[PDB]
Amino acid sequence: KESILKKLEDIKPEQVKKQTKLFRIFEPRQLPVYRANGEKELRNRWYWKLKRDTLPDGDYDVREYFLNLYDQVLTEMPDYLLLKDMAVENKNSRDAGKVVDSETAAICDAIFQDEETEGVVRRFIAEMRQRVQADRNVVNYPSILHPIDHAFNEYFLQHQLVEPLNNDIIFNYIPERIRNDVNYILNMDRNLPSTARYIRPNLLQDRLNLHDNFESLWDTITTSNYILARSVVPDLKELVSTEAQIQKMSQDLQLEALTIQSETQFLTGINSQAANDCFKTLIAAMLSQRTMSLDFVTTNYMSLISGMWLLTVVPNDMFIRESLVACQLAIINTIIYPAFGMQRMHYRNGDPQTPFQIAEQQIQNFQVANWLHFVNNNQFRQVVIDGVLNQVLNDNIRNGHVVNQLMEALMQLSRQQFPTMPVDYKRSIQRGILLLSNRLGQLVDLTRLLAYNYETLMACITMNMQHVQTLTTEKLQLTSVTSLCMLIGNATVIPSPQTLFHYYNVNVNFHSNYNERINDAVAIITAANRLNLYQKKMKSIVEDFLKRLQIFDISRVPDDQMYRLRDRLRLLPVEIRRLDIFNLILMNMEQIERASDKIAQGVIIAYRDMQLERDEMYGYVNIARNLDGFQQINLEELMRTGDYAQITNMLLNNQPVALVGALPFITDSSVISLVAKLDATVFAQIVKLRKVDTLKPILYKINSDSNDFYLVANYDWVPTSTTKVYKQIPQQFDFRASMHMLTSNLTFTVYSDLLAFVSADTVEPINAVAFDNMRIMNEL
């Protein structure tokens, strides 16, 4: 009864994230430049290369790489940022400005200090500084970036989540009802500036409908909220003393010592610590919507009497059927039908009608039939208020008037002889109900108090409070109900605003975390589906979704619930941040895979003496960059279903073909390896043994640094070859065009908690008033 509360209360808010380093995938790099004819220039040139060439072989592994990249980027994706933090100083600026990142200035310095750079670029480095405008609290900082990097950074800037803050938003963050409750007064001691910001939760209701066929998890959630709610219900105050009440009860009952009586048992369970137990059980159950059973005994007729009050002010749908069926049946047999000479009863076990139903249409008395009508037709009114569903009472219970019909009924039973039964039975019953008649006003005010605290604590709920019977129940002793109904008076007790703010913050944190973890899971699921990841079993992800909901034990959960939950999660859309990041990855993933000079995008085979291309970062290369004409064979299809008949038939008969899939390669840089046709010696291993993993095409990069290049100048032969490689080239580093200006705010501040500036206090609780502007606990 303490681990669960600690699991809840230790759910921190979502730690506000931030970044200090720009997102980057690419970096410049100097390479040589070999002029056409192949020979070398005294000058070099910059190119865009990747950081972290960690791309695997095979296309499936590549798509897993981009999945893990997407997860990394979402981790790095911030919520707010100020650019002045990451800023640095350009050592070569006219106005001694600042640029945005360390690596930016490193690039600028490297380029400026070099010898082979134009004057325009150095000018452009001397002209680039930081601009402010404190009117709008806006800054523009320069930056150097690849266009993918710019895409991600700009998305981070524009789509960051912060909202201006002021005291009006501190109020409106509080629920309506509590501000509208006159019994609470609220002030503060600060005036927040326009500079201030705050992050908002995600209090979106359950997309997953755990109130439908996930009854074990729902029992868990419901229990957790129940035993939280117990922690916030007030403890009663200024109760009646137990001996002072027991003496009245005993003298009213005239307990003879010698003779045996049913009337001693009415003193069973009259202590305090049960009154508070019932008071804390009923409300917590109605808030959590957790069902509860009734343990009791058929000889303590006071329990059966107090059950009347109970079944009035608490709906029959709130209990489990067999328990209140037994209770109603006991009551019918031993208070009601003997009080009109009716039969005892003949109640079938699984009868669809509960005993108070067919009792409503046998007896002939208006008061008792009206009482029974209310009981049988009392039920929670569903109503959506301030975004949240609420299980609201009748509003004939919120005021205490039901108790008056209950009194009418009990008095119209007191005025009935029991012709069937002896004097002592009647005597017992009539005494037992005098004990409650004399507590009438206390009962009225008690009912009002319960309803008041129920709605007041309901106001501090964020998740829709569905009503469904749970697996597991809470025990309710009717002796505690008797104790509450008997020991209560002249003492209103109201939840302190601190308990209210705590019960609100707990639910808010849990609710936001629920929604955010849902978004996580849906993101990874949709991404694995759209990346065609077909071997991936989506089970670990649901474990990561449940371990983060810190109330469930996964060591004892099944493995089919995870996939049902997955089936629900696939249907949910993605949020905007994650979806847009993913779509920025999709339209650019191929371009990233073009880079990473470790794998190539396929190898052509064409038994014809084709020509090598005049690329200038290389010299002559056996490179292809269109893959048009010669047809193509995918490799994942071949590595799934080994059917090497096609490729074998094509290789043995020397048919042109292309092979498509991420494949390694070696850079060979010898003309003697070219003339001898060695790049066609790599494929004979496929037919011997039918694996395609030892497949490393040659990349004949030829230049004036290749140890035999004297031939090329001195015989006038264009290097020709067979079996070209499919691969694009790097993109040249244009400094001016790779430069950008980054907009951001200037010097805001972020606040996580929000109900700290409030300072609340109640009015004096005796002059505490309900919705009807008519006092509660006034019967004196």
Partner: peptide
């Protein structure tokens, strides 16, 4: 507690 929870958020301002 709450007083330290208020103190952090007053101090971000102060």
């Amino acid at each position: 507690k709450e007083e330290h929870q208020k103190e952090v958020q007053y101090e971000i301002l102060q």
